[PDB]
Amino acid sequence: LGARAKESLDLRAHLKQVKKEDTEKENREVGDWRKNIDALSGMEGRKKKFES
């Protein structure tokens, strides 16, 4: 019985570990980066173009 249980759980843990490997490789470089809008106060009012 212990052998049956070990074989089943070992196969399960082998698939579990192969699944972990992908997460181990990278974990953050999949998300995009920050580019929020803020500041810009110092820019001038009479734009060099007429969309002012």
Binding site: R34, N36, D38, A39, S41
Partner: protein, 57 residues
């Protein structure tokens, strides 16, 4: 006569220009103050928003 009419017209146009540009200068001062107050509000918003982004992260 020609000088009399020219002087009347000159006085009226002078008065119109003077009132126009006194109003314009008063608007200049008032609009300066409005720009500065909205600019300070904007700066304050920028500090708040900076802290906001930090807290979000």
């Amino acid at each position: 006569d020609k000088y009399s009419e020219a002087l009347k017209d000159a006085q009226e146009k002078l008065e119109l220009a003077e009132k126009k540009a006194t109003d314009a200068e008063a608007d200049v001062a008032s609009l300066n103050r409005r720009i500065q107050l909205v600019e300070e509000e904007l700066d304050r918003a920028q500090e708040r928003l900076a802290t906001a982004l930090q807290k979000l992260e």
